[PDB]
Nucleic acid binder design. Structure first.
Lengths: 96, 80, 92, 107, 96, 82, 108, 92
DNA sequence: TGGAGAATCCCGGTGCCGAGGCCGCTCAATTGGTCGTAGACAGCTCTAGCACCGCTTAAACGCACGTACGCGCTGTCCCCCGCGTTTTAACCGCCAAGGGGATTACTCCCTAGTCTCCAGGCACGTGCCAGATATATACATCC
DNA sequence: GGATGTATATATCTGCACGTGCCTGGAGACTAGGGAGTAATCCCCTTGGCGGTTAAAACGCGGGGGACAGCGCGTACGTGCGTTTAAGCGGTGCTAGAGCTGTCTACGACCAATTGAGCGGCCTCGGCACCGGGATTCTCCA
């Protein structure tokens, strides 16, 4: 049948907060890292641990930013996050 | 080129589900891609500077750990 | 021949949790934790020695660094453990 | 020459006093390093390692496992206020996040 | 008689206190507060005048930055009035 | 023994500090929260300043101790030496 | 002997090369300090000092003032993006804040 | 007695703005700025020398410390005057 | 839309105190030579990183319904802003005690440095126990 | 009250902890010299007090505007399902280059003599804070 809008989201919240696995696919992130590093030095090599460290740091930073974004959405009496909440979180954090 | 689209919509959805977000707007994904690109540009630029100071052509995990420790984002588990 | 704190965290773990093991990534994390706490305390003691025009690091500087760094109960118990260690080292 | 008794054994410690003294000496912290500074520092590091391993062992037994994983270390650090204050700017690899859902999101 | 509308004196005060550099807390109550706080740590303690001046400058700068973030949080909730929940949101996003 | 000096940080002083922060309208429960925030911040700085004083075996808290305490919390202050 | 030519004079600098050199030796940074490191560091510090001082003099001239007060230094640092990024966790004493009233607070 | 960058920043000010002076508080703030930036660059260069197993701080260490610490155009220009000053010092 | 009261901006006069320049000196920068070692360079090696292929399969992607929910509008009523008057304590000037911070002398014990030596710690190797996987049953949620 | 996600229990298989040989770094023992403890002194500077005065805080009161609750509505994500696609795992191969070792030489620490630039002290003049009066916005109400 059809579930209500929100219960699969809450089930996914309870699922992904119980796990440690990386939520971004490895090859697109590695290609993005090599695309970004091409502007700084031509013909660079990467260890696998370097890309894994970058992915772990990026995923932790994005999860914390989405927690602050969720606070900013709740503060405006909303359960939906919006780009203004991300901008406000980065403004209070000092990143903008 | 155009590898920022590899960070797909369900990947950002899973990252927000780990952050506890119940509902996500459709304009969230481009904003999160820009945020990720800025963060990766900062850390990768610092790690490339650390690599080229050592006269190497391989970005080690040690360079990424020091690049993150420069910005107050200390990472445990990759040789720190 | 890379040196690490693996056997020492093994010894502490078997000293307090005898039927409990540890994994390789967890020991990389604990080694990074020990190195980071070492760097914080030694840097604060180096600053403490430089501010007071002193050229030596003693137990007083590391104690003050522990009081500056660690939160309240952690700082109190670390001060107590280290003072016990220094008194036992001097008494023996 | 008498029996070589280590400085960790006569202080009653498990962390190496000699290695901590060597890393203090060549770490360019001060011109001199006293005798009691590596003993005090290794005692403090041993206490902090013991606290982390106590809470990580409790978190491992809570998940019915006898081996400490990074998730157990993350739960140990962030479930204590003082260890979360000490390790606030620290990302633990393969640690995840603690289960928290805001009360306005529940049905 | 003559009575200004609510908000004009507030904006005039915003311009006046943003153009100026003077300390906005009275010095003697701040000094008494500093002695009262410091007597809980070490009794029979003295203070230089420049130490209390440094504490006043740091406290005023911290409170002004906190009130800027509080005003941003109040604007994000479609309001012009600052409330304690805005202060709590700004402090938790900063991580205090 | 000094007691209850947090009321010396008055409501007009908090209003002036909010005016410098660009605030047009202020609620009435703001002032107690601002006093608590100020007390927490002053306790955090003053504890490190007293610790730096006690390491130097002095009975006076100097300005340079406060500068070191603020440089510790990432709140470096320019104008009182360093 | 020869004439005592200052190391800052032969490097084309106003900041002292020798004082940066003694502060690098006695600051507990390395066991050895090279010859060109204090020249480089004094040049970088002099460039940053000139970059703040030019904008502070412009801010003092725009306020019809001759001498530079900490308000002008605060305006110079906060009005430049790179200087505000460099000096973002630093409070200038008697510096004040930038004039910034939000758009939703102004009357219509 | 006490040492400060008092005459040098005045020399730089008269080089840049020859009809503009300075106050005592602005002097103390500029002295604190020079001391803090010097401490940042020297600490980063010490860390860079320790990371690459080197016991010497060279102009390369200061150059990559400026590249790490300063933002973009500031870093590019400061590298340019640092290289110019080192070249003029070595050539004469 | 015009106009009155309030506020802000602007110009001339006055004094004051802090910046700016001059001088003595002293200590710290410079110059010249020596010496030991840190690092630059050359060679080699073997390790891990990159490039491509195949498959199979999980995950990304397109699309449709629909329902909750973000957003705009309206009323109301309470809370905070503006202003006047009284009170109160901040602030400035001054005047003393006296703790204590800063400096100097000395003197001693504590730590750097060195030679010798052995035992703790690390790399390598192996074999065995802890989780990961798969399937059926009932417990826990969901509509 | 019926229909699904998920503990719970049992077999099974594979990819951390103990043992050992070498080796190298910590420890014992001794010397040398200088960093800091300790006593004495003295002078800045911190605290406590008194008094006038006046500026700022506190209290009260009127009123208006904005925060908050309620309600409608149109739309845009949530969820589900079929289709596509490229992540991922396993495998092969090849060449860059990370890392180690050896040799030599340039370069920075170190020491002693010299001397001059920077710092403390002092004196004096102009930038600016303040005041008073007039010109120009400027906000609110008829």
């Amino acid at each position: 049948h059809r579930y209500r809008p929100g219960t699969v989201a809450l089930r996914e919240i309870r699922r992904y907060q119980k796990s440690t696995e990386l939520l971004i696919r490895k090859l697109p992130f590695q290609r993005l890292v090599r695309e970004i590093a091409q502007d700084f030095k031509t013909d660079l090599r990467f260890q696998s641990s370097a890309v894994m460290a970058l992915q772990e740091a990026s995923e932790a930073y994005l999860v914390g930013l989405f927690e602050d974004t969720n606070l900013c959405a709740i503060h405006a009496k909303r359960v939906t996050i919006m780009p203004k909440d991300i901008q406000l979180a980065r403004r209070i954090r000092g990143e903008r | 080129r155009d590898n920022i689209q590899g960070i797909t919509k369900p990947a950002i959805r899973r990252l927000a589900r780990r952050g506890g977000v119940k509902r996500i707007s459709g304009l969230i994904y481009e904003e999160t891609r820009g945020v990720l690109k800025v963060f990766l540009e900062n850390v990768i630029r610092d790690a490339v500077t650390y690599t080229e100071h050592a006269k190497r052509k391989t970005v080690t995990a040690m360079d990424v750990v020091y690049a993150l420790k420069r910005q107050g984002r200390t990472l445990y588990g990759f040789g720190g | 021949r890379k040196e690490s704190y693996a056997i020492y965290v093994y010894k502490v773990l078997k000293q307090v949790h005898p039927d409990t093991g540890i994994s390789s990534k967890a020991m990389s994390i604990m080694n990074s934790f020990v190195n980071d706490v070492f760097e914080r305390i030694a840097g604060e003691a180096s600053r403490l020695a430089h501010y007071n025009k002193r050229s030596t690091i003693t137990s007083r500087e590391i104690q003050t660094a522990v009081r500056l760094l660690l939160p309240g109960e952690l700082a109190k118990h670390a001060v107590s453990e280290g003072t016990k260690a220094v008194t036992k080292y001097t008494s023996a | 020459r008498a029996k070589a008794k280590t400085r960790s054994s006569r202080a009653g410690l498990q962390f190496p006093v000699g290695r901590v003294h060597r890393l203090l000496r060549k770490g360019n912290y001060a011109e001199r390093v006293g005798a009691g500074a590596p003993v005090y520092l290794a005692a403090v590091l041993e206490y902090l390692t013991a606290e982390i391993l106590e809470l990580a062992g409790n978190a491992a037994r809570d998940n019915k496992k006898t081996r400490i994983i990074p998730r157990h270390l993350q739960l140990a650090v962030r479930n204590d206020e003082e260890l979360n204050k000490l390790l606030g700017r620290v990302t633990i690899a393969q640690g995840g996040v603690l289960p928290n859902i805001q009360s306005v999101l529940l049905p």
